[PDB]
Design a protein around this nucleic acid. Sequence first.
RNA 1: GUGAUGCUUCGCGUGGAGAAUGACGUAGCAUGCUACG
RNA 2: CGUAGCAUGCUACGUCAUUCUCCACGCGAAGCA
Lengths: 186, 188, 73, 929
Amino acid sequence: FSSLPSYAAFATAQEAYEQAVANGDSEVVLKKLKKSLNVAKSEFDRDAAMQRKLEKMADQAMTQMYKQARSEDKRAKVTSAMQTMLFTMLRKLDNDALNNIINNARDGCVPLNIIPLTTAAKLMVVIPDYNTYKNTCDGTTFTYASALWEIQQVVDADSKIVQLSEISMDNSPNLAWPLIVTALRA
Amino acid sequence: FSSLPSYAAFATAQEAYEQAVANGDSEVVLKKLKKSLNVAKSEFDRDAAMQRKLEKMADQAMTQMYKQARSEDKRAKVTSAMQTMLFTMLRKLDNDALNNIINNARDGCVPLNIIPLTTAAKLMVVIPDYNTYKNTCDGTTFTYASALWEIQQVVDADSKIVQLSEISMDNSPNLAWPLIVTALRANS
Amino acid sequence: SKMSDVKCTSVVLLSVLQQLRVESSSKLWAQCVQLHNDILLAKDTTEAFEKMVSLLSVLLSMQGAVDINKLCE
Amino acid sequence: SADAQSFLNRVCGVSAARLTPCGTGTSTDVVYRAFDIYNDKVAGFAKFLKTNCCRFQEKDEDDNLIDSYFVVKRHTFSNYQHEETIYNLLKDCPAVAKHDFFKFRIDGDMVPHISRQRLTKYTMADLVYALRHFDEGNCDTLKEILVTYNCCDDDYFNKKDWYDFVENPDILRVYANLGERVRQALLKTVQFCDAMRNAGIVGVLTLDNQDLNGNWYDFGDFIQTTPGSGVPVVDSYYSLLMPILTLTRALTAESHVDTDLTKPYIKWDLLKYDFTEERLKLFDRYFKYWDQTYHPNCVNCLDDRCILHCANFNVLFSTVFPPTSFGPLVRKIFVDGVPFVVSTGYHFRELGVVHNQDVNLHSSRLSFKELLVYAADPAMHAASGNLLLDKRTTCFSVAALTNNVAFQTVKPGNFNKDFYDFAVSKGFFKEGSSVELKHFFFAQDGNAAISDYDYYRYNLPTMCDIRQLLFVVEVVDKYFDCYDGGCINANQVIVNNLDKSAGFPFNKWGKARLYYDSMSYEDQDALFAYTKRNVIPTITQMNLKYAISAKNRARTVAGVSICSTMTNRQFHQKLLKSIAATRGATVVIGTSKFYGGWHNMLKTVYSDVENPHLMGWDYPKCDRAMPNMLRIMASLVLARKHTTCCSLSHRFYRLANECAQVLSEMVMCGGSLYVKPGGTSSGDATTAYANSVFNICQAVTANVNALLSTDGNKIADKYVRNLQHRLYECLYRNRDVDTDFVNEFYAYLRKHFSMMILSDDAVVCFNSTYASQGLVASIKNFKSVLYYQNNVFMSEAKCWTETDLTKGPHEFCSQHTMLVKQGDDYVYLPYPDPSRILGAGCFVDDIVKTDGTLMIERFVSLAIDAYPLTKHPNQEYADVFHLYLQYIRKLHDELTGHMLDMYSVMLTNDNTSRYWEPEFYEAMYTPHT
RNA sequence: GUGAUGCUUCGCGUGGAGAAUGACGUAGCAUGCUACG
RNA sequence: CGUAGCAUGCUACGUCAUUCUCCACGCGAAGCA
Ligand SMILES: Nc1ccn([C@@H]2O[C@H](COP(=O)(O)OP(=O)(O)OP(=O)(O)O)[C@@H](O)[C@H]2O)c(=O)n1
Ligand SMILES: *P(=O)(O)OC[C@@H]1C[C@@H](O)[C@H](n2ccc(=O)[nH]c2=O)O1
Ligand SMILES: [Mg+2]
Ligand SMILES: [Mg+2]
Ligand SMILES: [Zn+2]
Ligand SMILES: [Zn+2]
């Protein structure tokens, strides 16, 4: 505690104590200095205690406002924060199937239903282009989620069956994209 | 404090002592004017302590009165809400069938569990699977609790309207079970 | 060795699905809950990862719900 | 073989019965059978070895053995004369097995022989012992009984856990097939008694003197009397048979017209609720010679012992009556001219019909108390609601209060990625690590609350051994003699948290604070006095719990109405606070585990047992499978502290309110009302203490069964032998309470069966020598008691035993024990599962809690919990606590940095430097304070 | 829409007992000095 | 040696200003069972 009106009184009295004791003065002066110094000490203690209480109250209020602000920030941005966290964790996992399906989704090739796990498994996968088709499909086998599937039918944008032979680099402009390939797990 | 005349008396005494000291006190009686100052200080501090104590006690009493008023004002709110709910339920139950069954009672008391069974005009059947559907509430009308119920509506767990033709053995996997079938008591 | 990562990731994934209002579909939410709880009660890493792929298929199926390209820079 | 074949022909006795011996010639056969014996030497219901009978099995006309035996008994001439005279009196009775008295020249003298003809292989004693001492390891009499009477097929036991009520509910059906046989036995017993009464024969009826066809034999201890003054004694018979009458559902035939299983069910009047005369007719039909008064309505009972006695019979008989007849009895009152429907009574399965004493018709106004009572009552809600046919459950559905069914899901927990990243950076969660994440927040779908409520199907009507229970209740109340109870005033009640739910329908206008502020102490005392004279049926709201666990289960708790909770507090809080304020007792509720409390509790349970072993158990689905009789007994034990403040009627009406509110009340689970079959409503004012009473009752019952089912001749200690004899006398021969023997048995249990009870958790320090000799209960006895008195099979994965007491109990309140040098002496410290603490750190139930900087006291509490792991000999468990300390330091640094960035301040708050040093947490387990 | 009870940590407030420093009033023991008798 | 008045040292009680240990309760937050 410094820069208080009673702090200067304390400094002056305590500095004068050394002079009084070392000045060879009478003990009446000693009692006078004791009285003045102790009175200033008590007054400065009162002022310092009140100032400490004010600082403590300021600290508490500041902490509470910080907590409310942080809680509001944390709750408001829950959605985007959770999504970013999810994809950071997925990237850290570095699994073959997860990376495969995530890359296909980034390219626009997404499923229309939960990717089944059993052998008796019907999966419908959308395909928005011929390039992704040829990259992720060839012949009558469809590689997806680090697994092999056997195609059954492709039904184009407007529902209409398409034979596999009808999908090719020359034939791509004719077809009505996007396509929907339904396949069975290998 | 300042309002209390004791503070004024102390201020006058201290001013007199300060003026006497500045002008030059005699010798031993300056100690006596300081003594009067000290007596004033003690008495004024004692008065101010009781001042603060009474002020805080009055503040506590005002807070108590505010809280009591709020409690009495919320008691009225909850009383009115309960009365409104009770009146709504009174005007929501069919008096004819209830009166008939209560009069059929030998002494006046009836089991509660039979009041909806014998008087409810609407039935709600929650079906977990299609086997239970075919077993309990197949068709447009069905018999339950010795009464005939005409199926009014069918919805799924998502509250989407379901047509009775949708419910089938092959189409069961496509429905969001359980189904809620709302039926009306046929011919009372 | 990628067995506590999968369970935490499944928790975060089901939280994200819940944010995207998937409980509005009783069947889809039931399947999601089944996958999540099975992954949590899993000792085999391969079973957990296949169930994780199935669970992530729910998020990826809804094309417009999330913007994958921005999320995966 | 001429002598043997001649003996075989003589046993036929004119009745051509195609006999084939069971032993070599005339040599007497030996079998190991259950006998309910009591004489000057031994007393008990145990398996003895009989070697004084020759068995000849009769075979069908096609050489197929049938269940017909000719048991030939060899006698002294005196008893041969005595039994012949009694039989000649009892010959005309159709419930008496045919006897043939003859004399056979064995070697050189005419030895007397008594042939009981066409007897079943097993007796009623064998069935009762097999079901009351069930051991999955060796249950061959039970299997043979089930197969022999076509209850099931011999391959039915190839299942795993075929005997488990939870894993294999179909076992109930298999047991129910026996019911009719048991019923016939009961009927025949009555006939036999009548014959005795008409023949002037005085004797004791025992289960082992009746076969599974209902026929009776023996007549060895029957004595002549005036022809019309016969006095059958049936206490042991009926009391030992009682637990089997509900397991086998014997009285099911009573639900059919003409009491015929072929004919259809009786069509009772739907408006009928008073079956008092039907209950009396059932009692006279079956328990005619049970010589203690039965009150169909327990409002007329003399004391709590009589109440339990008659409630047992009411439990048995209520299974015959339609479920729609039980519940609030609603009358039409007129208030201010408008007609209300209000519950003016209640039909209890156990207590019969109760009618409110203050039913004010033509009321002029409703005050706050009356309005609250009417709002609480399910009369209006059920009467004005729709009809519900919820097929998702087997519990009786009453009404649908809303036009839409509510599907409430459970959402997953929030992942604290900061703490998890920190942990993995500090070498956690690696493959092969002993510490791995196992506690999560499991999500649930819409059918979550209803699916958990459906677990009340494990609650079954359980008739108890009443003579045994009336002694067990006294011994259990001996455990609650160091406590002070009694009603208190509304101003003396302490409410821990007033921001909790007020129940239904009161949760749609405020919290409990609203109703504790709106209700004046005058109003609260008026409501209490009302509940002392009237039954208030309340609605219980089933609420899902959002908690972290290792088991994929959605716990549901009971939010009980504010009206019920207020009065229950005012009625029980004095006793509950006395229990929680007591140290060193069996019930250790209110005892802290900090500052040496764990060590004190363990040293107290150890006491001075001679050969100390530890054992412990958990009740599977404790609240869902608790019998109604045991819950009523617990409530009566707690209410017995009201001998100076409440009268008999007041205590009974408080019991009736407790039953109507937290035993079989109406349950609101998803906007719809159902009827709870029974079991505790976890969420009532006394859940933790009723559970403790129930646990102590089960333990005392296990000890009683262990001591009475022990061959008395094999006890080498005369004190224990006389104690067993007196125990049998006090159960099945004394009607009043023998306080001296109750104190003797309590002292015996305390000396050899020291207990430490906290709700459904228990730790027993027991004398292993006595347990091995069968003098005190072992874990097998506890399983046997639970099987028939709780309708739950207890597996060994739910129980544990510890031979070395320096290891402490294996688990208690989810805490493990470690004996660690703390200063100059070794102390027992509790430590949790490290996975539990790590899951608490990593997974949370609030988005704001995933930011650790705001929640630092949370991690301080977690570190306080995790501290005792530093003393573990495993370095991973020890590192768990240091992980929390380091993370707390990091959180404080981050908080200081954030406060410096957002503001222009300096926290410089290192009074918090004590939160990342071990002394703050080490001081929490030292006995200083 | 989130129950009953137990224990524990933290923050805040009021209250009681007690400790320390200090101002100061009354009374009393007691040292020194002026005046009356 | 008594009385009045004035001054110095030591001590008891009473009331105040400040701090802190422990506690009884109240309120808020949290953790575990
Ligand atoms: N949040 C909780 C948890 C438990 N209990 C009480 O503790 C008893 C038993 O707890 P627990 O054994 O954990 O529940 P169970 O139903 O027995 O489940 P489990 O099969 O695992 O033993 C219950 O009867 C319940 O009333 C409670 O009141 N509140
Ligand atoms: P822990 O192993 O959770 O339970 C030990 C014991 C059993 C139970 O009755 C009681 N308990 C536990 C948890 C809870 O939330 N409430 C409760 O009463 O303590
Ligand atoms: Mg349990
Ligand atoms: Mg437990
Ligand atoms: Zn009675
Ligand atoms: Zn009382």
